[model samples]
Target: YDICKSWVTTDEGPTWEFYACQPKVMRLKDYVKVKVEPSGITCGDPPERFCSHENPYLCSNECDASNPDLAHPPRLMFDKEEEGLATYWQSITWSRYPSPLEANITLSWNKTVELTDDVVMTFEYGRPTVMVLEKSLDNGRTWQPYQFYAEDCMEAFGMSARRARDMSSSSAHRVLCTEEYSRWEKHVRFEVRDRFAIFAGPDLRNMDNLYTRLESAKGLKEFFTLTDLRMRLLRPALGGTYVQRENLYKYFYAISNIEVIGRCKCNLHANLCSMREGSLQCECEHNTTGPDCGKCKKNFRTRSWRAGSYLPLPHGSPNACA
Candidate 1:
């Protein structure tokens, strides 16, 4: 009876109604609704592309293998047979900045030398302590006594020859002196003399014996004369940090025809400026505040001010612009 009826009949049998039968569906090239159920997912540590290996030579308390210059190796000295107990004395270099007249000489050793022995150490044999004069013939083993003006009968006199002593004690054998000269002058001589005449044996014997030993010792001669016999102020190195600030200022002032007004501001964090009246003043620059002008800028804010605001924006009268 119906063209799309749910029933069917065979040659010898009769069919019943098919209630489950439905109409044919049409198709089109369109997206379908996908009822997707999210799957369970987990995360783990990321894959490592590269690994680092420990340096064999770099250990705690040991020198760093990456930097060989920082290693603190033992001081190398001459052998027992060399000279003066085989100790080493470093070269004394005189550094000059701006001018030779503003230069200074500094002597440093690998290790501090003890002047326990008896010998002469003199500076300007008969001059005041102001002049630069000192002599050490025995590798700093001994120092001569002081020579006053009456004994030397010269304008420059050696005040006293003192031994290099233990740094901890007040009075020891060593001699540490600094000489400040007026300026570079031709043929200037600062003498450091040793006056061992007053002391007797034991101490004196040690001094004489050390000098004799140094004279006979070879290779030791190389360490002699840390500085030249004739003392001339050296020219300051091109870029040396060992400059005396005051002297440097003086030199620059002389060259530029500018007046040097102040001393170096020794304060660690202050700007160094010379004043017009021969004094020093530390002035802070604009937008910066500090003894050395090391600060941030203070100015108007981007936001507008509001009453009772917790973090109020910048707002004030014209005079409150500080």
Candidate 2:
């Protein structure tokens, strides 16, 4: 739990030893700020009626933003659980014939966070036939593709399909398109644990090895760090067939939940994070300060700043500000 500091008896006296540490994992969705692009993307504004792929004719479900029980706002994507189809964020139907229905869901934290587990998304109706998972490390100024999801990897994205589980230690950080999570499946995931298992062992039992890998690999730690995440839904589910012109109302996106299991990225100088100034900030330690403890304090600049190191096993060096 408390891996930041420890008490050790020195030859002179008892002293505190600092180590490379991080904050505890948390449900990052609770702290995220969500935004769905293209105004009026959410359904129920005009009180339109839609149907499902299972039964296209039974188009009785109504979406009226004014009605509490009928609305499907963007906030529903991060809300608590609901046993039934009582809550979900739904998009408008793909009524435009050749426009190509697209929806962009951007989740911003304004603070760097490290993915410790899978980033899972639970869909209500069906998952997108083609989508891209993106990330931004410098707020939302720029973006990069984290993972590509498509029913046809080569056809849709022109990239060969690869699974996270099939990656070796050298290729663990490689970003490739995957056909595994496509189709009409209700859940889509960006596997983090499977990538960790490349060096951590099958069940993540040897976490020390994982930590060592994270420290040794050039960009492995950075691969899991991001300040924001975006989901570019390029196309809606087509029921494993071409889009029928007659039943355009059945084509849309609906999300029930998004699970982001991560912790604040404090550069290994913090073991606690909390809300401050309407943003997540690390409770910095070892005379380090800043949103991510990326630099030394004002007067503790005797030595050039350096990130903590996970080496020599057990208690790693904190590289505290001198």
Candidate 3:
């Protein structure tokens, strides 16, 4: 029984029988096996675990980027301490005063990225008191205002500002105080500009009207067909409740970075996809192959299905179907 392991073919290429009943049929060969067919293709829908950097292979989509500086996944899951919306934000750079001279300033992420459900921005030291941002899908041929759920901007700010306030301190009234979170919540009792330290979805109160509203992020997939994604943050947290400057800004926070996110493009057919080497590895079926599994194999052929039995041609054999 062990000598004759049945050979089987599956959508995943090929397979063979196993002999677990104490038999050693060792004719070993190598193999394996989509965009998910019937699974999903919408942003954050279908409960996707698609990483930002690792492009996800959806119906006809792919993951284009991912991050970590601790993290900052699709949604702002505040409970995930390390994965907040602002954790991995790249540092800011300035067009006029590029890095090295970045003690009081730094520019933001300026390159045009693909597109995403949201345009997330991060500010350190404090929230932006002045922020002007834009986007472009036409390869920068033109520009447009980058916007998002006006409410979410405030939601993210609440947590940031509260941190500065309830536990604050400044050395020169012109510089930011580098204080710890645990200390502020317990021993400190000071106040400052915008920042967050709570769950999302609440009315942002004063911060909503005051804090800077960067580019729009989510639900832009419709027109986000999106690109030329550029954001600008001229002001960080100018230390003034009723007391800061708009131009000579201090306690400033620059635009850390902006990443335009979009879904995967995997046209799976009767098969699913897997992530390998940070790309879409299609699970082609029906003898198909390719990144999208969009066509049949080049040399392989499938015989005619209707020829139940071919009539034997005479020895002279001028084939009819030939």
Give the best candidate by TM-score.
Answer: 2
Instruction: Please identify model 2 stretches exceeding 4 Å from their true place.
Output: 53-55
Number of clashing pairs per prediction, in order = 47, 1, 48
TM-score of every candidate relative to the true structure: 0.16, 0.96, 0.28
Prediction RMSDs, each to the true structure? 40.2, 1.4, 22.9
| lDDT computed for candidate 2 | 0.90
Clashing pairs in 2: 44-63
Q: What is the lDDT of candidate 3?
A: 0.28
lDDT of each: 0.23, 0.90, 0.28
Runs off by more than 4 Å, candidate 1: 1-100, 116-193, 201-322
The order of the candidates by TM-score, greatest first, is: 2, 3, 1
Q: By the TM-score metric, which is better: model 1 or model 2?
A: 2
Which 10 successive residues of model 3 have the least lDDT summed?
27-36
| Cα lDDT tens digits for candidate 3, 8-72 | 78889788532111112111110100011122211223221321223323322221223232322
Return the lDDT, model 3, position 259.
Answer: 28
